[PDB]
Short mmCIF file of all heavy atoms in Angstrom, two decimals:
data_model
loop_
_atom_site.label_atom_id
_atom_site.label_comp_id
_atom_site.label_asym_id
_atom_site.label_seq_id
_atom_site.Cartn_x
_atom_site.Cartn_y
_atom_site.Cartn_z
N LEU A 1 -40.86 -44.59 67.55
CA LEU A 1 -41.97 -45.35 68.11
C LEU A 1 -42.51 -44.61 69.33
O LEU A 1 -41.75 -43.93 70.02
CB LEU A 1 -41.51 -46.74 68.56
CG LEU A 1 -41.12 -47.83 67.56
CD1 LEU A 1 -40.58 -49.04 68.30
CD2 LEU A 1 -42.27 -48.23 66.66
N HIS A 2 -43.81 -44.73 69.59
CA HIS A 2 -44.35 -44.30 70.87
C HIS A 2 -43.97 -45.34 71.93
O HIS A 2 -44.19 -46.53 71.74
CB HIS A 2 -45.87 -44.17 70.80
CG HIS A 2 -46.34 -43.05 69.93
ND1 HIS A 2 -46.44 -43.17 68.56
CD2 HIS A 2 -46.77 -41.80 70.23
CE1 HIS A 2 -46.90 -42.04 68.05
NE2 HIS A 2 -47.11 -41.19 69.04
N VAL A 3 -43.39 -44.88 73.03
CA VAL A 3 -42.95 -45.75 74.11
C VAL A 3 -43.75 -45.42 75.36
O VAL A 3 -43.79 -44.26 75.79
CB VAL A 3 -41.43 -45.58 74.41
CG1 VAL A 3 -41.00 -46.45 75.59
CG2 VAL A 3 -40.59 -45.90 73.17
N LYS A 4 -44.39 -46.43 75.93
CA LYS A 4 -45.13 -46.28 77.18
C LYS A 4 -44.18 -46.41 78.35
O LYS A 4 -43.26 -47.23 78.33
CB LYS A 4 -46.23 -47.33 77.27
CG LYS A 4 -47.13 -47.22 78.50
CD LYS A 4 -48.13 -48.36 78.52
CE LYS A 4 -48.45 -48.81 79.94
NZ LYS A 4 -47.35 -49.56 80.61
N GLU A 5 -44.39 -45.58 79.37
CA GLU A 5 -43.58 -45.63 80.57
C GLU A 5 -44.03 -46.81 81.42
O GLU A 5 -45.23 -47.09 81.50
CB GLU A 5 -43.71 -44.32 81.35
CG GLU A 5 -42.40 -43.81 81.94
CD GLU A 5 -42.59 -42.78 83.04
OE1 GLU A 5 -43.74 -42.33 83.27
OE2 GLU A 5 -41.58 -42.42 83.69
N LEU A 6 -43.07 -47.50 82.03
CA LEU A 6 -43.35 -48.65 82.90
C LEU A 6 -44.43 -48.35 83.94
O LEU A 6 -44.34 -47.37 84.68
CB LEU A 6 -42.07 -49.12 83.60
CG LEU A 6 -41.31 -50.36 83.11
CD1 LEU A 6 -41.33 -50.53 81.60
CD2 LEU A 6 -39.86 -50.34 83.63
N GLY A 7 -45.47 -49.19 83.95
CA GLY A 7 -46.52 -49.15 84.98
C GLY A 7 -47.45 -47.95 84.98
O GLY A 7 -48.32 -47.86 85.85
N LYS A 8 -47.28 -47.04 84.03
CA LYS A 8 -48.16 -45.87 83.93
C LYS A 8 -48.74 -45.78 82.53
O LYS A 8 -48.08 -46.17 81.56
CB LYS A 8 -47.40 -44.58 84.24
CG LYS A 8 -46.54 -44.62 85.50
CD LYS A 8 -45.71 -43.35 85.63
CE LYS A 8 -44.64 -43.50 86.71
NZ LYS A 8 -44.17 -42.18 87.22
N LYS A 9 -49.95 -45.25 82.41
CA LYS A 9 -50.59 -45.08 81.11
C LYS A 9 -50.17 -43.78 80.41
O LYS A 9 -51.01 -43.00 79.95
CB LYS A 9 -52.12 -45.15 81.27
N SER A 10 -48.85 -43.54 80.33
CA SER A 10 -48.32 -42.32 79.71
C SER A 10 -47.25 -42.60 78.65
O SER A 10 -46.27 -43.32 78.90
CB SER A 10 -47.79 -41.35 80.78
OG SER A 10 -46.53 -41.75 81.28
N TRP A 11 -47.43 -42.00 77.47
CA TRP A 11 -46.60 -42.28 76.29
C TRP A 11 -45.71 -41.10 75.87
O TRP A 11 -46.01 -39.95 76.16
CB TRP A 11 -47.50 -42.69 75.12
CG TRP A 11 -48.31 -43.93 75.35
CD1 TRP A 11 -49.45 -44.04 76.09
CD2 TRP A 11 -48.05 -45.24 74.83
NE1 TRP A 11 -49.92 -45.33 76.07
CE2 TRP A 11 -49.08 -46.09 75.30
CE3 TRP A 11 -47.06 -45.78 74.00
CZ2 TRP A 11 -49.14 -47.45 74.98
CZ3 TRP A 11 -47.12 -47.13 73.68
CH2 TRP A 11 -48.16 -47.95 74.17
N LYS A 12 -44.61 -41.41 75.18
CA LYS A 12 -43.77 -40.38 74.56
C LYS A 12 -43.12 -40.93 73.29
O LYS A 12 -42.56 -42.04 73.30
CB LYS A 12 -42.69 -39.88 75.53
N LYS A 13 -43.21 -40.16 72.21
CA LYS A 13 -42.59 -40.54 70.95
C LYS A 13 -41.07 -40.41 71.08
O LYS A 13 -40.57 -39.36 71.48
CB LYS A 13 -43.13 -39.69 69.80
CG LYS A 13 -42.80 -40.25 68.41
CD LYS A 13 -43.85 -39.85 67.38
CE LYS A 13 -43.35 -38.76 66.46
NZ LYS A 13 -42.56 -39.33 65.34
N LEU A 14 -40.36 -41.49 70.75
CA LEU A 14 -38.91 -41.55 70.92
C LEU A 14 -38.21 -42.24 69.74
O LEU A 14 -38.78 -43.11 69.09
CB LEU A 14 -38.56 -42.28 72.22
CG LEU A 14 -38.80 -41.55 73.55
CD1 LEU A 14 -38.92 -42.55 74.69
CD2 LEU A 14 -37.72 -40.51 73.85
N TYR A 15 -36.97 -41.83 69.48
CA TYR A 15 -36.13 -42.55 68.54
C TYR A 15 -35.60 -43.81 69.21
O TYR A 15 -34.91 -43.74 70.24
CB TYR A 15 -34.97 -41.70 68.05
CG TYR A 15 -34.31 -42.27 66.81
CD1 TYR A 15 -34.98 -42.27 65.59
CD2 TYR A 15 -33.02 -42.79 66.86
CE1 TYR A 15 -34.37 -42.79 64.45
CE2 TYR A 15 -32.41 -43.30 65.73
CZ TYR A 15 -33.09 -43.30 64.53
OH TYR A 15 -32.49 -43.79 63.40
N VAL A 16 -35.95 -44.95 68.63
CA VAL A 16 -35.74 -46.24 69.27
C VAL A 16 -34.67 -47.03 68.56
O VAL A 16 -34.61 -47.05 67.33
CB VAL A 16 -37.07 -47.01 69.39
CG1 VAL A 16 -36.85 -48.47 69.73
CG2 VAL A 16 -37.95 -46.36 70.45
N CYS A 17 -33.83 -47.68 69.35
CA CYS A 17 -32.66 -48.38 68.87
C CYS A 17 -32.57 -49.77 69.48
O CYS A 17 -32.36 -49.91 70.68
CB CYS A 17 -31.40 -47.58 69.19
SG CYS A 17 -31.28 -46.00 68.31
N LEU A 18 -32.72 -50.78 68.63
CA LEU A 18 -32.63 -52.19 69.03
C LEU A 18 -31.24 -52.74 68.74
O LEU A 18 -30.70 -52.55 67.64
CB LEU A 18 -33.66 -53.02 68.24
CG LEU A 18 -34.42 -54.18 68.88
CD1 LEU A 18 -35.01 -55.08 67.81
CD2 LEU A 18 -33.59 -55.01 69.84
N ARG A 19 -30.65 -53.42 69.72
CA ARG A 19 -29.45 -54.23 69.52
C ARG A 19 -29.60 -55.54 70.29
O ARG A 19 -30.50 -55.66 71.14
CB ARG A 19 -28.19 -53.50 69.99
CG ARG A 19 -27.64 -52.47 69.01
CD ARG A 19 -28.14 -51.11 69.40
NE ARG A 19 -27.63 -50.05 68.53
CZ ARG A 19 -28.36 -49.41 67.62
NH1 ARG A 19 -29.64 -49.72 67.44
NH2 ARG A 19 -27.80 -48.44 66.90
N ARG A 20 -28.72 -56.51 70.01
CA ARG A 20 -28.71 -57.78 70.74
C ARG A 20 -28.65 -57.57 72.25
O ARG A 20 -29.20 -58.36 73.02
CB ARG A 20 -27.55 -58.68 70.29
CG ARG A 20 -27.58 -59.08 68.81
CD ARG A 20 -26.57 -60.18 68.49
NE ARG A 20 -26.58 -60.53 67.07
CZ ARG A 20 -27.52 -61.27 66.47
NH1 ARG A 20 -28.55 -61.76 67.16
NH2 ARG A 20 -27.43 -61.52 65.17
N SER A 21 -28.00 -56.48 72.67
CA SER A 21 -27.78 -56.21 74.09
C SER A 21 -28.99 -55.59 74.78
O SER A 21 -29.01 -55.48 76.02
CB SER A 21 -26.57 -55.30 74.26
OG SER A 21 -26.73 -54.12 73.50
N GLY A 22 -29.99 -55.19 73.99
CA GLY A 22 -31.23 -54.62 74.52
C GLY A 22 -31.98 -53.67 73.60
O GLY A 22 -31.60 -53.47 72.44
N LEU A 23 -33.06 -53.11 74.12
CA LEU A 23 -33.81 -52.08 73.42
C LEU A 23 -33.50 -50.75 74.10
O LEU A 23 -33.68 -50.60 75.31
CB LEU A 23 -35.31 -52.36 73.47
CG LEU A 23 -36.22 -51.37 72.75
CD1 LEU A 23 -36.30 -51.70 71.26
CD2 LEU A 23 -37.63 -51.35 73.37
N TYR A 24 -33.01 -49.80 73.32
CA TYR A 24 -32.67 -48.48 73.83
C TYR A 24 -33.51 -47.43 73.13
O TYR A 24 -34.14 -47.69 72.10
CB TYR A 24 -31.20 -48.16 73.59
CG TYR A 24 -30.19 -49.22 74.00
CD1 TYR A 24 -29.98 -50.36 73.20
CD2 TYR A 24 -29.42 -49.07 75.14
CE1 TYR A 24 -29.04 -51.33 73.55
CE2 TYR A 24 -28.48 -50.03 75.50
CZ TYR A 24 -28.30 -51.15 74.70
OH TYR A 24 -27.37 -52.09 75.07
N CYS A 25 -33.51 -46.23 73.70
CA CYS A 25 -34.06 -45.05 73.05
C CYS A 25 -33.06 -43.92 73.19
O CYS A 25 -32.30 -43.87 74.15
CB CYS A 25 -35.40 -44.67 73.68
SG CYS A 25 -35.28 -44.13 75.39
N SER A 26 -33.07 -43.01 72.22
CA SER A 26 -32.14 -41.88 72.21
C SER A 26 -32.61 -40.80 73.16
O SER A 26 -33.81 -40.51 73.23
CB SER A 26 -32.00 -41.32 70.80
OG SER A 26 -31.03 -40.28 70.77
N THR A 27 -31.67 -40.22 73.91
CA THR A 27 -31.97 -39.11 74.82
C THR A 27 -31.67 -37.76 74.17
O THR A 27 -31.77 -36.71 74.80
CB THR A 27 -31.18 -39.21 76.17
OG1 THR A 27 -29.79 -39.48 75.91
CG2 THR A 27 -31.76 -40.32 77.03
N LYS A 28 -31.29 -37.80 72.89
CA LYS A 28 -30.99 -36.60 72.12
C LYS A 28 -31.33 -36.82 70.64
O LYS A 28 -30.50 -37.32 69.87
CB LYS A 28 -29.52 -36.22 72.29
CG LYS A 28 -29.17 -34.83 71.80
CD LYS A 28 -27.68 -34.62 71.75
CE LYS A 28 -27.34 -33.19 71.37
NZ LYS A 28 -25.89 -33.02 71.11
N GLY A 29 -32.56 -36.46 70.27
CA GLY A 29 -33.03 -36.56 68.90
C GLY A 29 -32.90 -37.95 68.31
O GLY A 29 -33.50 -38.90 68.83
N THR A 30 -32.11 -38.05 67.24
CA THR A 30 -31.90 -39.32 66.54
C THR A 30 -30.47 -39.84 66.69
O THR A 30 -30.00 -40.67 65.90
CB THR A 30 -32.29 -39.22 65.04
OG1 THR A 30 -31.50 -38.22 64.39
CG2 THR A 30 -33.76 -38.87 64.89
N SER A 31 -29.77 -39.35 67.72
CA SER A 31 -28.42 -39.79 68.01
C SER A 31 -28.41 -41.19 68.61
O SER A 31 -28.99 -41.43 69.67
CB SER A 31 -27.72 -38.82 68.95
OG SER A 31 -26.42 -39.29 69.27
N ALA A 32 -27.76 -42.11 67.91
CA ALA A 32 -27.60 -43.48 68.37
C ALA A 32 -26.27 -43.64 69.10
O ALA A 32 -25.78 -44.76 69.29
CB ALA A 32 -27.68 -44.43 67.18
N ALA A 33 -25.67 -42.52 69.48
CA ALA A 33 -24.41 -42.56 70.21
C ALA A 33 -24.62 -43.28 71.53
O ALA A 33 -25.66 -43.09 72.17
CB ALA A 33 -23.88 -41.15 70.44
N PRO A 34 -23.65 -44.12 71.94
CA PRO A 34 -23.78 -44.83 73.21
C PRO A 34 -24.11 -43.89 74.38
O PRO A 34 -25.01 -44.18 75.16
CB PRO A 34 -22.41 -45.48 73.39
CG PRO A 34 -21.89 -45.63 72.01
CD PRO A 34 -22.40 -44.45 71.25
N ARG A 35 -23.41 -42.77 74.46
CA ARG A 35 -23.64 -41.76 75.49
C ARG A 35 -25.05 -41.15 75.45
O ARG A 35 -25.48 -40.54 76.42
CB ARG A 35 -22.62 -40.63 75.40
CG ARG A 35 -22.69 -39.83 74.11
CD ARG A 35 -22.52 -38.36 74.40
NE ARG A 35 -21.12 -37.96 74.52
CZ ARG A 35 -20.73 -36.86 75.15
NH1 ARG A 35 -21.62 -36.07 75.73
NH2 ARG A 35 -19.44 -36.56 75.21
N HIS A 36 -25.75 -41.33 74.33
CA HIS A 36 -27.11 -40.82 74.18
C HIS A 36 -28.16 -41.93 74.20
O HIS A 36 -29.35 -41.67 73.99
CB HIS A 36 -27.25 -40.00 72.89
CG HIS A 36 -26.35 -38.80 72.84
ND1 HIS A 36 -25.57 -38.51 71.74
CD2 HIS A 36 -26.10 -37.84 73.75
CE1 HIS A 36 -24.88 -37.41 71.98
NE2 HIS A 36 -25.19 -36.98 73.19
N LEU A 37 -27.74 -43.17 74.45
CA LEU A 37 -28.68 -44.29 74.51
C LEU A 37 -29.03 -44.68 75.94
O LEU A 37 -28.16 -44.89 76.78
CB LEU A 37 -28.15 -45.51 73.74
CG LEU A 37 -27.96 -45.36 72.23
CD1 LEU A 37 -27.21 -46.55 71.66
CD2 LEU A 37 -29.29 -45.16 71.50
N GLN A 38 -30.33 -44.76 76.20
CA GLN A 38 -30.86 -45.17 77.49
C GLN A 38 -31.44 -46.57 77.34
O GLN A 38 -32.25 -46.80 76.44
CB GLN A 38 -31.94 -44.20 77.93
CG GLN A 38 -32.33 -44.29 79.39
CD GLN A 38 -33.35 -43.22 79.76
OE1 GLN A 38 -33.09 -42.02 79.60
NE2 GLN A 38 -34.50 -43.66 80.25
N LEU A 39 -31.02 -47.50 78.19
CA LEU A 39 -31.52 -48.87 78.13
C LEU A 39 -32.96 -48.93 78.62
O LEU A 39 -33.27 -48.48 79.73
CB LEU A 39 -30.63 -49.82 78.94
CG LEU A 39 -31.00 -51.30 78.98
CD1 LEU A 39 -30.86 -51.97 77.62
CD2 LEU A 39 -30.17 -52.04 80.03
N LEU A 40 -33.84 -49.47 77.78
CA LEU A 40 -35.25 -49.60 78.13
C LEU A 40 -35.58 -51.02 78.58
O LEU A 40 -36.12 -51.23 79.68
CB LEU A 40 -36.15 -49.20 76.96
CG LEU A 40 -36.24 -47.72 76.57
CD1 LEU A 40 -37.30 -47.57 75.48
CD2 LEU A 40 -36.56 -46.83 77.76
N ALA A 41 -35.26 -51.99 77.73
CA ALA A 41 -35.53 -53.38 78.02
C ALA A 41 -34.35 -54.29 77.70
O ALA A 41 -33.74 -54.19 76.63
CB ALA A 41 -36.77 -53.84 77.26
N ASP A 42 -34.01 -55.15 78.66
CA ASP A 42 -33.17 -56.32 78.43
C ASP A 42 -33.98 -57.26 77.54
O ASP A 42 -35.22 -57.22 77.56
CB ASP A 42 -32.84 -56.99 79.76
CG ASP A 42 -31.64 -57.91 79.68
OD1 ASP A 42 -31.67 -58.88 78.89
OD2 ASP A 42 -30.68 -57.68 80.43
N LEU A 43 -33.30 -58.09 76.74
CA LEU A 43 -34.02 -58.98 75.82
C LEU A 43 -33.95 -60.44 76.22
O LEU A 43 -34.73 -61.26 75.72
CB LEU A 43 -33.53 -58.83 74.38
CG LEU A 43 -33.49 -57.46 73.69
CD1 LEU A 43 -33.27 -57.70 72.21
CD2 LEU A 43 -34.76 -56.65 73.92
N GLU A 44 -33.02 -60.77 77.12
CA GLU A 44 -32.86 -62.13 77.62
C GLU A 44 -34.15 -62.62 78.27
O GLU A 44 -34.81 -61.87 78.99
CB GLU A 44 -31.71 -62.22 78.63
CG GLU A 44 -30.32 -62.24 78.01
CD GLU A 44 -29.27 -62.77 78.97
OE1 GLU A 44 -29.15 -62.24 80.11
OE2 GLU A 44 -28.55 -63.72 78.58
#
């Protein structure tokens, strides 16, 4: 998905990973490894 950066009109295509605990994106290609997941949004 294209992900917009908070508060700025700038986008980057990222491998995106949804779980109950939040929305993450991969910091290394398509690796869904916890060590490669960056938390984007809390869902609560």
Side-chain angles (χ1 to χ4, degrees), residues 1-8 10-11 13-44:
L1 290 174
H2 292 82
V3 177
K4 184 183 146 287
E5 221 198 352
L6 258 35
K8 313 174 192 201
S10 77
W11 299 77
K13 195 152 104 84
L14 287 159
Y15 196 69
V16 166
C17 294
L18 218 198
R19 281 96 178 107
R20 299 191 181 284
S21 55
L23 181 83
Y24 311 77
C25 65
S26 184
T27 48
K28 193 191 185 189
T30 60
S31 177
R35 64 138 82 201
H36 300 132
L37 296 170
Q38 195 176 302
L39 180 67
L40 289 186
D42 198 301
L43 306 193
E44 282 199 306

